[PDB]
PDB file of C-alpha atoms and ligand atoms in Angstrom:
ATOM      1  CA  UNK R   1       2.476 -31.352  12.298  1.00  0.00           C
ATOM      2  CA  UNK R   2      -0.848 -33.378  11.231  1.00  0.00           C
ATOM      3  CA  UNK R   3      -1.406 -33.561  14.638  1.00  0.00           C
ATOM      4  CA  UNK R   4      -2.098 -29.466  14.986  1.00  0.00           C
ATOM      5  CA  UNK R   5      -3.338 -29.538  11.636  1.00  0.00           C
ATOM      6  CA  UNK R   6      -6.023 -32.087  13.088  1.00  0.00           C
ATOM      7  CA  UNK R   7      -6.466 -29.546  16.023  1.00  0.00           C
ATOM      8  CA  UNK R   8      -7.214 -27.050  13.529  1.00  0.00           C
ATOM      9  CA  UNK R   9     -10.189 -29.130  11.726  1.00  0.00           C
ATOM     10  CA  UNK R  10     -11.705 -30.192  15.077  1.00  0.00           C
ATOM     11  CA  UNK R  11     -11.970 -26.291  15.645  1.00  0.00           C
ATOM     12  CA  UNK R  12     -13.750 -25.992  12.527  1.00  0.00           C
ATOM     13  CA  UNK R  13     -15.624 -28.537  13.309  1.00  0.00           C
ATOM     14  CA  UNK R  14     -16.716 -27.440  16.509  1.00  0.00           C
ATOM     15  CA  UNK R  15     -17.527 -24.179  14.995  1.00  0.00           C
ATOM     16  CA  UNK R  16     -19.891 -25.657  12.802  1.00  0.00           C
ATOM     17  CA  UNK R  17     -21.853 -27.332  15.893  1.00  0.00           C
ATOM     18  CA  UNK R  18     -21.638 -23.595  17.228  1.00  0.00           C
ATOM     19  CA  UNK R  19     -23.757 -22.324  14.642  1.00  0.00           C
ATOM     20  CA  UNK R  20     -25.644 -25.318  13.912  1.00  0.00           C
ATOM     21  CA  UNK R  21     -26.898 -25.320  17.321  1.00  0.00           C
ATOM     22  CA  UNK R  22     -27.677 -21.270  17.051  1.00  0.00           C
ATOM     23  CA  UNK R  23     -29.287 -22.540  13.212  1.00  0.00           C
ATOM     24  CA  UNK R  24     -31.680 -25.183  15.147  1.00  0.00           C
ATOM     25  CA  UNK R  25     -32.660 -22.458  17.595  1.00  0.00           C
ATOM     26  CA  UNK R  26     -33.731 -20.002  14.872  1.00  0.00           C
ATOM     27  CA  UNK R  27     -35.704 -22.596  12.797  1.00  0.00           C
ATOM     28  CA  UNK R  28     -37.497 -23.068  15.863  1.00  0.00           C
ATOM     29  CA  UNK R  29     -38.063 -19.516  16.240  1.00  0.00           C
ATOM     30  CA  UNK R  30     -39.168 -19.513  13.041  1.00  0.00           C
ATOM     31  CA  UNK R  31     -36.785 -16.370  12.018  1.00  0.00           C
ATOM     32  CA  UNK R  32     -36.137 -17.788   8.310  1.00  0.00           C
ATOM     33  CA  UNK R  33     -33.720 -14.653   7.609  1.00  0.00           C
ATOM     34  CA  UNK R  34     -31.550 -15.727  10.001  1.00  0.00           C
ATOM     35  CA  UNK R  35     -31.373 -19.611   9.242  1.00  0.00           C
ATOM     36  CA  UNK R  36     -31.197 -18.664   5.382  1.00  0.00           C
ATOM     37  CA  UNK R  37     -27.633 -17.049   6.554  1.00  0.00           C
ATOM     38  CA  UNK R  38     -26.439 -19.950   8.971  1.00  0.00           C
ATOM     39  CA  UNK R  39     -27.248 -22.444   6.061  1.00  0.00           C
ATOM     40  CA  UNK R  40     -24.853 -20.562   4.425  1.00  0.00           C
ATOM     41  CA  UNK R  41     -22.327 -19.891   6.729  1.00  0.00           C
ATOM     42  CA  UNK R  42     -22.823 -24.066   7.406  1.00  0.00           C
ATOM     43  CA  UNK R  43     -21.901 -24.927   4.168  1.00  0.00           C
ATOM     44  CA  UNK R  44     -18.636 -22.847   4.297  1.00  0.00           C
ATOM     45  CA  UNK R  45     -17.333 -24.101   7.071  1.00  0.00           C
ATOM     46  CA  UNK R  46     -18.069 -28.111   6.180  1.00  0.00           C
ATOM     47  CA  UNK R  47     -16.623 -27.559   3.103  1.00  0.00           C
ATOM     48  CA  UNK R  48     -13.414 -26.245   5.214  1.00  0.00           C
ATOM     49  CA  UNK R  49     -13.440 -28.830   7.594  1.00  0.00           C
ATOM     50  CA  UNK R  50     -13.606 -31.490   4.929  1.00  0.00           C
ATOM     51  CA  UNK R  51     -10.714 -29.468   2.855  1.00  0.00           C
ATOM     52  CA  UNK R  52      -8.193 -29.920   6.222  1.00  0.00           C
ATOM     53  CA  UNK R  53      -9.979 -33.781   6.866  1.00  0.00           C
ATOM     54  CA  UNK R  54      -9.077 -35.076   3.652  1.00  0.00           C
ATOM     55  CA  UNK R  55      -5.229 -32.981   3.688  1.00  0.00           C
ATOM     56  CA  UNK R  56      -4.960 -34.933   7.084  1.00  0.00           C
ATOM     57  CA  UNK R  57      -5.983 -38.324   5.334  1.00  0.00           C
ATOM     58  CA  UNK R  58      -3.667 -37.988   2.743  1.00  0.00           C
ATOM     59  CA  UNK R  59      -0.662 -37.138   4.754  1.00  0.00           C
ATOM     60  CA  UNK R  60      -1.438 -39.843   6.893  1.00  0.00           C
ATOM     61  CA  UNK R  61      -1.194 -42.125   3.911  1.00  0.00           C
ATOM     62  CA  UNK R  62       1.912 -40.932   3.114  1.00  0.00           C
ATOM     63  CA  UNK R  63       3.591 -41.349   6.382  1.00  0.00           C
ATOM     64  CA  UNK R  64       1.939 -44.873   6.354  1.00  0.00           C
ATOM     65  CA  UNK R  65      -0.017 -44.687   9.566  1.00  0.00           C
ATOM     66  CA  UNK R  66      -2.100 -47.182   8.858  1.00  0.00           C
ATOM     67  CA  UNK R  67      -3.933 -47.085  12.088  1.00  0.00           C
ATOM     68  CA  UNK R  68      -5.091 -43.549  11.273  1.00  0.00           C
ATOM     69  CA  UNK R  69      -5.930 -44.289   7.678  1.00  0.00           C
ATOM     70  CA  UNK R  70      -8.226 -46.981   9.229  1.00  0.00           C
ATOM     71  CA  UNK R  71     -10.151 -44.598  11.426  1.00  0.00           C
ATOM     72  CA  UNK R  72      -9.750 -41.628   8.634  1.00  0.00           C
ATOM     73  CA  UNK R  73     -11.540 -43.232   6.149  1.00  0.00           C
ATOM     74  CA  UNK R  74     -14.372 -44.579   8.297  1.00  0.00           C
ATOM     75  CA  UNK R  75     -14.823 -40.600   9.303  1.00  0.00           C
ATOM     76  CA  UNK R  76     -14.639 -39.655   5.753  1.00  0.00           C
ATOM     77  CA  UNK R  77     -17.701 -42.073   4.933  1.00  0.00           C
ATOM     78  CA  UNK R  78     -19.484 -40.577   8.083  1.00  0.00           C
ATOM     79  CA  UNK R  79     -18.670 -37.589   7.068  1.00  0.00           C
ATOM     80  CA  UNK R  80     -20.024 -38.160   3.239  1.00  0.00           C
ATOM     81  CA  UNK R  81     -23.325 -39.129   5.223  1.00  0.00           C
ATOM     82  CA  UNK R  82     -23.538 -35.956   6.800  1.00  0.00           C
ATOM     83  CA  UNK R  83     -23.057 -33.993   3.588  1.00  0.00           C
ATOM     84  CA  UNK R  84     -26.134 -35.637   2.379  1.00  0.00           C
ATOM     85  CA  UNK R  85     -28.539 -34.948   4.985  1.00  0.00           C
ATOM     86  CA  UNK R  86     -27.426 -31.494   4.780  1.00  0.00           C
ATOM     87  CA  UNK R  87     -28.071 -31.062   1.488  1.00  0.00           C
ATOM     88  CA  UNK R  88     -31.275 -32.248   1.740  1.00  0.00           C
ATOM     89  CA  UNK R  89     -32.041 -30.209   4.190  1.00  0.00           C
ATOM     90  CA  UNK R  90     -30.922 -27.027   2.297  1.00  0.00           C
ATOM     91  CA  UNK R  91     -33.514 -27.826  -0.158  1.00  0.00           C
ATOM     92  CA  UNK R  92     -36.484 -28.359   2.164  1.00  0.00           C
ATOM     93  CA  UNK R  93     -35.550 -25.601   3.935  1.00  0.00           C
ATOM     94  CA  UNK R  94     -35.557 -23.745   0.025  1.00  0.00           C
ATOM     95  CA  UNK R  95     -38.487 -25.763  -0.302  1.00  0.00           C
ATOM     96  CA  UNK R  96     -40.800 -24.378   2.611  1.00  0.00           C
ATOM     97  CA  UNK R  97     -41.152 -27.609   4.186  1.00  0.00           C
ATOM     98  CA  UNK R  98     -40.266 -27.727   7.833  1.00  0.00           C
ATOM     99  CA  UNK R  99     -41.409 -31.276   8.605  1.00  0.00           C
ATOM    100  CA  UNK R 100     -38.475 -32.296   6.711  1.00  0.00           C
ATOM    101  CA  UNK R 101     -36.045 -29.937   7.875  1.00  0.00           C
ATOM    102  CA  UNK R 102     -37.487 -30.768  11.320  1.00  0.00           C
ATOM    103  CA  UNK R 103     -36.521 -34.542  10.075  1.00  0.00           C
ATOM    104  CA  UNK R 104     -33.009 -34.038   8.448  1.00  0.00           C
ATOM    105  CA  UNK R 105     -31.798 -31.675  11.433  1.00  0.00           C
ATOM    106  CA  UNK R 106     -32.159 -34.635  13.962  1.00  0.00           C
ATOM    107  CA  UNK R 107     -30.570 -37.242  11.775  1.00  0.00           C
ATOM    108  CA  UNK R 108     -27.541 -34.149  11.360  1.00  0.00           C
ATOM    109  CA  UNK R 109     -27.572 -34.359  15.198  1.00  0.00           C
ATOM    110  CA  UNK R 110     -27.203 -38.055  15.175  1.00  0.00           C
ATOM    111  CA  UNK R 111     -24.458 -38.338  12.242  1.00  0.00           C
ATOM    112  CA  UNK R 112     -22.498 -35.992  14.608  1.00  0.00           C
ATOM    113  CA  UNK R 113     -22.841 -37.623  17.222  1.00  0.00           C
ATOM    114  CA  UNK R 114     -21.387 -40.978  16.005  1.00  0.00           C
ATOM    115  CA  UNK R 115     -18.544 -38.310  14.080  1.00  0.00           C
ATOM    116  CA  UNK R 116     -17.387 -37.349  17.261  1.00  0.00           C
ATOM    117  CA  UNK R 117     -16.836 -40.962  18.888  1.00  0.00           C
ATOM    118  CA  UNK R 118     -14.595 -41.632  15.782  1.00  0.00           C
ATOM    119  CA  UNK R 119     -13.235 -37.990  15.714  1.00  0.00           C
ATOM    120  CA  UNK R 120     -11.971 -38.718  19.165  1.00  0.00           C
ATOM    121  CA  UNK R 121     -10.178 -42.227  18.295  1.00  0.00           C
ATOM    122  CA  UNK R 122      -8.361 -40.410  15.581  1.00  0.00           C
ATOM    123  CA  UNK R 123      -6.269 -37.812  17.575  1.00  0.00           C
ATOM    124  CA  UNK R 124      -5.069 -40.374  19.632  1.00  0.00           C
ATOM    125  CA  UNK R 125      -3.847 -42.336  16.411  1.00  0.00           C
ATOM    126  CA  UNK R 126      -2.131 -39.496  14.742  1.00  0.00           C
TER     127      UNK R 126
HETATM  128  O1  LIG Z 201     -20.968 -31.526   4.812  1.00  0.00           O
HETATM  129  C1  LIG Z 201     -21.326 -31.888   5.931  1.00  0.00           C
HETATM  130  C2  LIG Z 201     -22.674 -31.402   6.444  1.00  0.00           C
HETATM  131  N1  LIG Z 201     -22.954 -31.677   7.836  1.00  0.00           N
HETATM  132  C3  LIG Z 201     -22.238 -32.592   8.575  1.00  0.00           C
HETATM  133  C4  LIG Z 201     -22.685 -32.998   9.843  1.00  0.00           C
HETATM  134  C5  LIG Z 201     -21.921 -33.929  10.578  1.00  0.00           C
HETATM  135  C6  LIG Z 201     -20.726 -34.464  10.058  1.00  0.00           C
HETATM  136  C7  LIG Z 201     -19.925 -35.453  10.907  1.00  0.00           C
HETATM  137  F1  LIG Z 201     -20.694 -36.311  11.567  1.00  0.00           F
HETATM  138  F2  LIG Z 201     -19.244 -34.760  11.821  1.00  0.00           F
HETATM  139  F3  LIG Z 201     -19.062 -36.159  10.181  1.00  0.00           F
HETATM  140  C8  LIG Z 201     -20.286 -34.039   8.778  1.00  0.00           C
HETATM  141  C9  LIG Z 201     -21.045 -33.098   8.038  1.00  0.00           C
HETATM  142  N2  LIG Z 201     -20.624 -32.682   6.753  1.00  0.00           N
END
């Protein structure tokens, strides 16, 4: 059902925190091998979670839960935010400069944070 498909992209999700909180822990470390190959293993698994968010969206437009669509497509735009800061902190991380990777991986913290409240909202709606 959407619903276990949804339980499926909030274990991708979580996943993501897993090794974005093992990425953070390494920068700090200052091991750039190792953050070089979470980056990459990041960007994998957002672009999976966003493949099974936006499968969920649409099949919740088609069974016309509108109350999910609601909450769905505010996620979506959070989640758009997100992709941003990520990207730019792939490139000052490519870019040697760890003030602004320093920057960008507290505002990913913070656009996660807010994710989550709304991430919550939607498996009761589905
Ligand atoms: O592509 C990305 C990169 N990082 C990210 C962090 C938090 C979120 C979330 F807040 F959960 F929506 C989404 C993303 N998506």
């Amino acid at each position: 059902s959407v619903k276990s498909e949804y339980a499926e992209a909030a274990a991708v999700g979580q996943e993501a925190v897993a090794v974005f909180n093992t990425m953070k822990a390494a920068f700090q470390n200052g091991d750039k091998e190792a953050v070089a190959q979470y980056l990459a293993r990041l960007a994998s698994l957002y672009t999976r979670h966003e493949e099974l968010l936006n499968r969920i969206l649409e099949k919740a437009r088609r069974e016309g839960n509108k109350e999910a669509v609601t909450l769905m497509n505010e996620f979506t735009a959070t989640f758009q935010t997100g992709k941003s800061i990520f990207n730019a902190m792939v490139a000052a991380f490519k870019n040697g400069d760890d003030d602004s990777f320093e920057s960008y991986l507290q505002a990913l913290e913070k656009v996660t944070a807010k994710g989550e409240t709304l991430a919550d909202q939607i498996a009761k709606a589905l």
